[PDB]
UniProtKB/Swiss-Prot annotation, chain A:
Residues annotated for a 2-deoxystreptamine antibiotic binding in this entry: Y64, D72, E102, E123, Y146, D170, H176, T211, G212, F220
Gene expressing this chain: aacC3
Molecular function GO labels: aminoglycoside 3-N-acetyltransferase activity; coenzyme A binding; identical protein binding; protein homodimerization activity
Result when mutating D170F: No effect in catalytic activity with gentamicin as substrate
Protein's UniProt name: Aminoglycoside N(3)-acetyltransferase III
Family: Belongs to the antibiotic N-acetyltransferase family.
Protein source organism: Pseudomonas aeruginosa
E.C. numbers: 2.3.1.81
SUPFAM superfamilies linked to this entry: TTHA0583/YokD-like (SSF110710)
Lineage: Bacteria, Pseudomonadati, Pseudomonadota, Gammaproteobacteria, Pseudomonadales
Reaction(s) catalysed by this chain's protein: a 2-deoxystreptamine antibiotic + acetyl-CoA = an N(3)-acetyl-2-deoxystreptamine antibiotic + CoA + H(+)
Length: 267, 261
């Protein structure tokens, strides 16, 4: 066994974020495992407070939220059960829809922050605070939620960064944007979703690339590990966690080239 | 100055290796750095710390297992069925990834190797026969397996620069866990029976992909984060030492609370 630490302070997390390369005004997408950072004096919100302190109010912080309770599976239910879901399941409400189960404690904290913004796409919904929170989350199209009209696309375009805080590299949502952009020999295209329109629940059909299964013989772990191996990003400790800092545009470029050279029209 | 035998012994003991322990090793020889006398000195140092009363195991598998023959042209499959050699524990090579040390261990005097081709384990030391004996061909990571026995004798898993995703013991956790759905595989394999090649059908849980929305890295990272195991440097490698019983219990709970029915 390994015993818990004396709790990390706000100031010592700011120092570590800066030592890693976080700079004022950057736009960051964070993937974190809170337990991996270790005990923090004041709890997990201090992680976010420290990171925004390193970024200043001129910086921007975004996290993937999705929607834990999306009823995207109801076509597989028998007719009577499906009818029950159609009538009784709540719509996606950006104010109260809970983020996906894993590695999302900080996303849920971010939702109680004043001036938080949440994008409109339920399954692909992102949350953000800071200078470009509105810009990044605006007009997130319902179809192809990781594509050209996504917060991921905008993060790449404003040359933001991805910060890994003890989360496995294959949870980098940006890699779904690489899948979207890459010209590949086989893609799976897929579902119902209740949303709010003028304050009333309406069911819509969302069209997207499948993001549950890969489009071919690969895994996100493979791409990311290949990226780190070739020098991508910077590394450093943040609390007890091993942290990685990646340029969004570079990683996206690398991943699209990775996918196209194996399964693309250049293979 | 390459790492000396003594330097590695002291690092193993600093990490928590002790005389008499039964240990499964997962290593990346590259990660350790140059060792004076080569990679075998890693194993000699570890066995020195364990003493002859200790036991050292690694996953070997079978690099050349022809479990893919049904996906070949029929004409080629027919050639495989006539000409591909059976699994022979004496000479079957281990799988290529992170296995330099497993191949070294296969030349140790008194090494034992378990009979399940795909799931084959090699071991030396006091309990090497116990661990490798009567390894069932079906469900090779299940109840009749070296992993089950490693847990029963309160052994350990030592990660020596190898990735946390490569912990074979977690396939035993997958076997044990009551989950909503587990994928079963059935595949052909030639083995030796009374000195003769016989092709058989092996049944197992899939070990190539997880049975649900998880990764082994994620489980082991959660384990470490909640205080599981010890950590430290061995040579140039990041090392982790886990108790096999506690890690299995943690991983089964982890799987059941997330993907149970
Ligand atoms: C309309 N959506 C479904 C389309 C359907 N055709 C897909 O099969 C289905 O995906 C299954 O569920 C994944 C769990 O992640 C399994 O894939 C995992 O298993 C292996 C695969 N190699 C791992 O290696 C890999 O990492 C994967 N994690 C798939 O079997 C989709 O729903 C999921 O994905 C949605 C994201 N849009 C979530 O919103 C849902 O809650 C739901 N989890
Ligand atoms: Cl978390
Ligand atoms: Cl190796």
């Amino acid at each position: 066994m390994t015993d818990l630490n004396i709790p990390h302070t706000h100031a010592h997390l700011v120092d570590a974020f800066q030592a890693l390369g976080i700079r004022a005004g950057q736009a960051l997408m964070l993937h974190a495992s809170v337990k991996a950072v270790g005990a923090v004096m004041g709890g997990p919100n201090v992680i976010l407070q420290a990171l925004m302190d390193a970024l200043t109010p001129d910086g921007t912080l975004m996290m993937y939220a999705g929607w834990q309770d999306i009823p995207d599976f109801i076509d597989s239910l028998p007719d009577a059960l499906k009818a029950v879901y159609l009538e009784q399941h709540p719509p996606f409400d950006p104010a109260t829809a809970r983020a996906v189960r894993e590695n999302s404690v900080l996303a849920e904290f971010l939702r109680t922050w004043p001036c938080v913004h949440r994008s409109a796409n339920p399954e692909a919904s992102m949350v953000a605070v800071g200078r470009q929170a509105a810009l990044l989350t605006a007009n997130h199209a319902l179809d192809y939620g990781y594509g050209v009209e996504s917060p991921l696309a905008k993060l790449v375009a404003i040359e933001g960064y991805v910060l890994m805080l003890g989360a496995p590299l294959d949870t980098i949502t940006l890699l779904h944007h690489a899948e979207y952009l890459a010209k590949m020999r086989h893609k799976n295209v897929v579902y119902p979703c209740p949303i709010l329109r003028d304050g009333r629940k309406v069911w819509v059909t969302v069209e997207d690339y499948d993001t549950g299964d890969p489009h071919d013989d690969y895994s996100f772990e493979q791409i990311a590990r290949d990226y780190v191996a070739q020098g991508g990003g910077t590394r450093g400790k943040v609390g007890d966690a091993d942290a990685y800092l990646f340029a969004a545009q570079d990683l996206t470029r690398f991943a699209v080239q990775w996918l196209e050279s194996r399964f693309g029209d250049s293979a």
